[PDB]
Design a protein around this nucleic acid. Structure first.
Ligand SMILES: [Mg+2]
Ligand SMILES: [Mg+2]
Ligand SMILES: [Mg+2]
Ligand SMILES: [Mg+2]
Ligand SMILES: [Mg+2]
Ligand SMILES: [Mg+2]
Ligand SMILES: [Mg+2]
Ligand SMILES: [Mg+2]
Ligand SMILES: [Mg+2]
Ligand SMILES: [Mg+2]
Ligand SMILES: [Mg+2]
Ligand SMILES: [Mg+2]
Ligand SMILES: [Mg+2]
Ligand SMILES: [Mg+2]
Ligand SMILES: [Mg+2]
Ligand SMILES: [Mg+2]
Ligand SMILES: [Mg+2]
Ligand SMILES: [Mg+2]
Ligand SMILES: [Mg+2]
Ligand SMILES: [Mg+2]
Ligand SMILES: [Mg+2]
Ligand SMILES: [Mg+2]
Ligand SMILES: [Mg+2]
Ligand SMILES: [Mg+2]
Ligand SMILES: [Mg+2]
Ligand SMILES: [Mg+2]
Ligand SMILES: [Mg+2]
Ligand SMILES: [Mg+2]
Ligand SMILES: [Mg+2]
Ligand SMILES: [Mg+2]
Ligand SMILES: [Mg+2]
Ligand SMILES: [Mg+2]
Ligand SMILES: [Mg+2]
Ligand SMILES: [Mg+2]
Ligand SMILES: [Mg+2]
Ligand SMILES: [Mg+2]
Ligand SMILES: [Mg+2]
Ligand SMILES: [Mg+2]
Ligand SMILES: [Mg+2]
Ligand SMILES: [Mg+2]
Ligand SMILES: [Mg+2]
Ligand SMILES: [Mg+2]
Ligand SMILES: [Mg+2]
Ligand SMILES: [Mg+2]
Ligand SMILES: [Mg+2]
Ligand SMILES: [Mg+2]
Ligand SMILES: [Mg+2]
Ligand SMILES: [Mg+2]
Ligand SMILES: [Mg+2]
Ligand SMILES: [Mg+2]
Ligand SMILES: [Mg+2]
Ligand SMILES: [Mg+2]
Ligand SMILES: [Mg+2]
Ligand SMILES: [Mg+2]
Ligand SMILES: [Mg+2]
Ligand SMILES: [Mg+2]
Ligand SMILES: [Mg+2]
Ligand SMILES: [Mg+2]
Ligand SMILES: [Mg+2]
Ligand SMILES: [Mg+2]
Ligand SMILES: [Mg+2]
Ligand SMILES: [Mg+2]
Ligand SMILES: [Mg+2]
Ligand SMILES: [Mg+2]
Ligand SMILES: [Mg+2]
Ligand SMILES: [Mg+2]
Ligand SMILES: [Mg+2]
Ligand SMILES: [Mg+2]
Ligand SMILES: [Mg+2]
Ligand SMILES: [Mg+2]
Ligand SMILES: [Mg+2]
Ligand SMILES: [Mg+2]
Ligand SMILES: [Mg+2]
Ligand SMILES: [Mg+2]
Ligand SMILES: [Mg+2]
Ligand SMILES: [Mg+2]
Ligand SMILES: [Mg+2]
Ligand SMILES: [Mg+2]
Ligand SMILES: [Mg+2]
Ligand SMILES: [Mg+2]
Ligand SMILES: [Mg+2]
Ligand SMILES: [Mg+2]
Ligand SMILES: [Mg+2]
Ligand SMILES: [Mg+2]
Lengths: 49, 272, 92, 9
RNA sequence: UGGUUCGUGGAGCCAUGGGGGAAUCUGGGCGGACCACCGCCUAAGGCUAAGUACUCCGGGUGACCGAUAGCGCACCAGUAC
RNA sequence: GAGCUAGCCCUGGCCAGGGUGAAGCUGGGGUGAGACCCAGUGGAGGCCCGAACCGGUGGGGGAUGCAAACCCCUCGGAUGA
RNA sequence: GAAUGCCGGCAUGAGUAACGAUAAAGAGGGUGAGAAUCCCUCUCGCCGUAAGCCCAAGGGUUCCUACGCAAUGGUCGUCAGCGUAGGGUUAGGCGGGACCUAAGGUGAAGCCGAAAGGCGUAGCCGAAGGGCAGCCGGUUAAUAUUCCGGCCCUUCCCGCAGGUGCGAUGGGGGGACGCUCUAGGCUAGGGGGACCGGAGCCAUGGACGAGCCCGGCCAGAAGCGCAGGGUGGGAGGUAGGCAAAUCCGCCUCCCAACAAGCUCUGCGUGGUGGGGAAGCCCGUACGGGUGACAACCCCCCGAAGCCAGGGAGCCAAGAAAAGCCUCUAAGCACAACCUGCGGGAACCCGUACCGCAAACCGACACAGGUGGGCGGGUGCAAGAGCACUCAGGCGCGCGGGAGAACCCUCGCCAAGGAACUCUGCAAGUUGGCCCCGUAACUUCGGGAGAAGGGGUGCUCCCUGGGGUGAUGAGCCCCGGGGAGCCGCAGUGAACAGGCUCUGGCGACUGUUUACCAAAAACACAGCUCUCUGCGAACUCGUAAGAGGAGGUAUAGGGAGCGACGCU
């Protein structure tokens, strides 16, 4: 059947990107938490040009 | 007149379509004056706030003239009468000698080629606009302003009118389509005649689809729902209500008057 | 800084085949435009540059057990020389 | 799995 | 209405949203309703070290652990997944 | 978190081939003028058969499966909500 | 020593079930330490509106090649999509950006909110929509509308030559639009050919024959030629298009009413360029040579594609903005703009490979899911259906034997035909087309494919219409009539309704419990009640605000009933 993962580079970027997270206090805290944690990747890596 | 069909299909046996014979050879509209992009959307910034809206034909807005006092004294020739997707009435395309082209909402009896004009001057004829005062008591009228210089707001639906009843210092009394008795300021413009396309009420949609074409989504009964959804939801195999009939939001829907009492508008109203 | 643009030449059975024609092809700085790439190979070889073609070459994911990484991203430019000229330093 | 089936039979 | 031990209690004091609305030393607040007496203070402007809290970081010590323990990680771990 | 799913918005795409034959046109007939009737034309429709396509009726298989909803036969719609 | 305890390790069932579609394999020869499994040849089977090609998304080295087999491969493995190394992705014209605007997002002004923040005309952002200049071949092991060859365009900038009041983010025009059906002429694609060109081939009884087999194009500026799309030309008056206009708009007189004329496309032709089979000979893991001086012509069918902004009809009444044309304002008219010709300048990112799948979404080399374009030939009425088959691609990554029960999937059956059973569940009968022929009832449409029947192949003769051709030969479509032939059987295979009568419920097409319920539930047109005079009622939000609605009682919100008839 159709599963739940339907990859889209634009969606992933607009949805979970560094700039989206930065836009709101909710998201800014996510970066803070991930930084303090020592996460190698703050936001998902969306590729291609 | 109303177009009628033979039952060559079920739902074609009741279906019924407007007569478009008053639609003069001018079916597609007029750029310049209108159209605008019209912005379909069944809801506010976010959430739906009027249920069951959506779908249905794309539209172009015809930006019509609801304040006729710009062109006081300037007459215009009625050039055409065309279909307007965004109202029950039809619209008149008129050419002002000025050059300017406006649409007026098209009254019953309006003929193409006719002369029409607005102002204190203005022969009392079908199509003309006047401040309410100079209009003879008892004449039927439409596109009436509520307060002066604020635009036509009463009687624009197809086949509607108001009748002038009498006067009272600065106000003339109106009898509105609903039957209400209203004091409306003398200085309010209103155009003589009834609205026309009066056979609009006689049309039978005929099937579900037609409803959808006009963007009317299926309306579901409270009875059909559940207690979470509606006061009428549940219980077992059908149910008669079990309380005084209500809206989904709990207010009673048979009888409960809802106009606020202390409206300052009150001292200008005399009926139902 | 013009000997900063051009890094090294590309050595391969394909780069050479551009020596019959006037297409000398070098690795370049990833951030360098066709237009500064011309102005560079001109002054460094005193040659009339007529066509610049550039392409990105993506780095290779190589692994050395447990430790997996990626090589540096490079860029190629293959540059066309006006009729008759040659870049002697590549003619090997 | 996570069910979600209701106890039928 | 909040604060104080104070949950309307005899409920003061200290803050305040609403209404009314003074006075300049013979002026004003308080000492638990209120009044008298006797006393303590001088509101509606602001700044002020130190003593106190903490431990990302550096150092010392341990009737603290010794690789299923001790931090999640003694090992390229907030990694692989 | 609406990359699954529900709805709506904006903008594009898709629907083989067959049937049936409304209005309306044209001619003829009829009448004081009509209504209406015959052809011929016409090509209407949440119209019909039926692929793609969207489904999931009934039965069988499958049940540590090919598969955490599949497969075979059969079946609903398929110019419209 | 226990907590269906926690982590780890190893047992049991067990050499048991399984090894992922029943599309299918056999052999010879290689290579190798080692071959059912790798390479090659021959034979066989399968897909072919694909199981074949080309994109988009997504994936990110999987591409090519060299050397390799510990693991990954459900077996093997000399192979690989795996390991090590190296090589590979070339653009002014394709796509995206130095262009535009949609929903929506953001957001100066401004409004609101304990804070965080929420709204918000202008503007900006925002795309398979608008705008925009490359076609055909040739090369690599791997890239090509990118490199190369030919032919053809686009912008800027600087020049000369000449034309004109030039000239704005501003005005106007245009761009610019629905659904259904469609006409004319073309192209793509396809069939045929006694004509043109070809290596060859007479087999096994017969055939040296207008014999068999293979192939008979593509691109192409200017100029033509043929289709067709756009569009009236004047002169006056002017108060409107938010300044100004000669422009547009509105009046009034002339000439046109025609596509005559201007332009704009499409298609043919075109200077020239390129391609160019079967077969045979070679060595590949494949490509090459020859066939060639290859020929490269005539008919026929013909689009859903092009001319395109074509035409007709209908109601539900069908984006914007910029490029483009034009008008003027500030300015400036030694500027500037336009035409022509020259030289010069033309960036950034993408390009490999998979792409109905072993490379994407499903923990897997997973029988599932996945958007667009091409999708040949024959026959069956047609068709993207169905059977076989071009090109192309595969035999699905365990095999070999055996011929028990039992299961799955399928074929057939004496006599009876539902006696089976909760139920004819299942399976069968029926089945396509053409033509007779059709009842109750009916809202006059329907019920109707009612039911029930007959015809269906092949041969010969006669003959009626078209279509393309000139009024004809041919080639292509529909027909009619008459004799006759064979078989058990003529939609001889494949695809293709069982029917009728009578009740209940729901009017009907529809919708619904993704993953046990598709229904008599929901919806539905329609009927009624009620609310609401517009800063409407109602709804969301603390508010601002927004929906309702740029609607106005024939309107909008709520409730019930649910076509229609009688009530
Ligand atoms: Mg416009
Ligand atoms: Mg909201
Ligand atoms: Mg938002
Ligand atoms: Mg309902
Ligand atoms: Mg329910
Ligand atoms: Mg409730
Ligand atoms: Mg009951
Ligand atoms: Mg109830
Ligand atoms: Mg590039
Ligand atoms: Mg308290
Ligand atoms: Mg006090
Ligand atoms: Mg005190
Ligand atoms: Mg005391
Ligand atoms: Mg004190
Ligand atoms: Mg110890
Ligand atoms: Mg140890
Ligand atoms: Mg540890
Ligand atoms: Mg640990
Ligand atoms: Mg007729
Ligand atoms: Mg039809
Ligand atoms: Mg239908
Ligand atoms: Mg069907
Ligand atoms: Mg469903
Ligand atoms: Mg014990
Ligand atoms: Mg257990
Ligand atoms: Mg264990
Ligand atoms: Mg056993
Ligand atoms: Mg056994
Ligand atoms: Mg077994
Ligand atoms: Mg297998
Ligand atoms: Mg070997
Ligand atoms: Mg086959
Ligand atoms: Mg790799
Ligand atoms: Mg490979
Ligand atoms: Mg193995
Ligand atoms: Mg496997
Ligand atoms: Mg090898
Ligand atoms: Mg490899
Ligand atoms: Mg382009
Ligand atoms: Mg730049
Ligand atoms: Mg923009
Ligand atoms: Mg906008
Ligand atoms: Mg905002
Ligand atoms: Mg942009
Ligand atoms: Mg575009
Ligand atoms: Mg000018
Ligand atoms: Mg404009
Ligand atoms: Mg012989
Ligand atoms: Mg040509
Ligand atoms: Mg003006
Ligand atoms: Mg050849
Ligand atoms: Mg048209
Ligand atoms: Mg703009
Ligand atoms: Mg302009
Ligand atoms: Mg490429
Ligand atoms: Mg490619
Ligand atoms: Mg390739
Ligand atoms: Mg596809
Ligand atoms: Mg496999
Ligand atoms: Mg698969
Ligand atoms: Mg599909
Ligand atoms: Mg075809
Ligand atoms: Mg057929
Ligand atoms: Mg098929
Ligand atoms: Mg029997
Ligand atoms: Mg028998
Ligand atoms: Mg019998
Ligand atoms: Mg029985
Ligand atoms: Mg029995
Ligand atoms: Mg029964
Ligand atoms: Mg059955
Ligand atoms: Mg029955
Ligand atoms: Mg029945
Ligand atoms: Mg029903
Ligand atoms: Mg149904
Ligand atoms: Mg279910
Ligand atoms: Mg079911
Ligand atoms: Mg059903
Ligand atoms: Mg509003
Ligand atoms: Mg509105
Ligand atoms: Mg209502
Ligand atoms: Mg009901
Ligand atoms: Mg009911
Ligand atoms: Mg009922």
């Amino acid at each position: 059947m159709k599963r739940t993962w339907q990859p889209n580079r634009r969606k992933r970027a607009k949805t979970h990107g560094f700039r989206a997270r930065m836009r709101t206090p909710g998201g800014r805290k996510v970066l803070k938490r991930r930084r303090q944690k020592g996460r190698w990747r703050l936001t998902p890596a969306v590729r291609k040009r | 007149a109303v177009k009628k069909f033979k039952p060559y299909t079920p739902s074609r046996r009741f279906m019924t379509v407007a007569d478009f014979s008053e639609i003069t050879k001018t079916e597609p509209e007029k750029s310049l004056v209108k159209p605008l992009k019209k912005t379909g959307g069944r809801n506010n910034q976010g959430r739906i706030t009027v249920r069951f809206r959506g779908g249905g034909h794309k539209r172009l807005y015809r930006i019509i003239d609801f304040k006729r006092w710009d062109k006081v004294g300037i007459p215009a020739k009625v050039a055409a009468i065309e279909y307007d997707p965004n109202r029950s009435a039809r619209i008149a395309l008129l050419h002002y000698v000025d050059g300017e082209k406006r649409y007026i909402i098209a009254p019953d009896g309006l003929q193409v080629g006719q002369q029409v004009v607005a102002g204190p001057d203005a022969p009392i004829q079908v199509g003309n606009a006047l401040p309410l005062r100079f209009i003879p008591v008892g004449t039927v009228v439409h596109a009436v302003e509520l307060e002066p210089k604020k635009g036509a707001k009463l009687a624009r639906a197809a086949g509607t009118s108001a009748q002038i009843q009498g006067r009272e210092g600065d106000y003339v009394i109106l009898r509105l389509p609903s039957g209400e008795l209203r004091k409306v300021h003398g200085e309010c413009y209103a155009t003589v005649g009834a609205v026309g396309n009066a056979d609009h009420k006689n049309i039978v949609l005929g099937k579900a689809g037609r409803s959808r074409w006009l963007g009317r989504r299926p309306h579901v009964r409270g009875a059909a729902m559940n207690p979470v959804d509606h006061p009428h939801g549940g219980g077992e195999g059908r149910a008669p209500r079990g309380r005084p009939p209500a809206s989904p939001w709990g207010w009673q829907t048979k009888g409960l008057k809802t106009r606020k009492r202390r409206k300052p508008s009150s001292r200008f109203i005399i009926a139902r | 800084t013009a000997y900063d643009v051009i890094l090294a030449p590309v050595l391969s059975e394909k780069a050479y085949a551009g020596f019959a024609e006037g297409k000398y092809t070098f690795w370049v700085h990833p951030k360098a435009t066709k237009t500064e790439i011309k102005n560079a190979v001109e002054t460094a070889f005193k040659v009339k540059v007529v066509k610049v073609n550039t392409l990105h070459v993506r780095g290779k994911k190589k692994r050395l057990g447990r430790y997996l990484g990626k090589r540096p991203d490079r860029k190629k430019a293959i540059v066309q020389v006006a009729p008759g000229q040659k870049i002697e330093a590549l003619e090997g | 799995x996570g069910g979600p089936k209701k106890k039928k039979k």
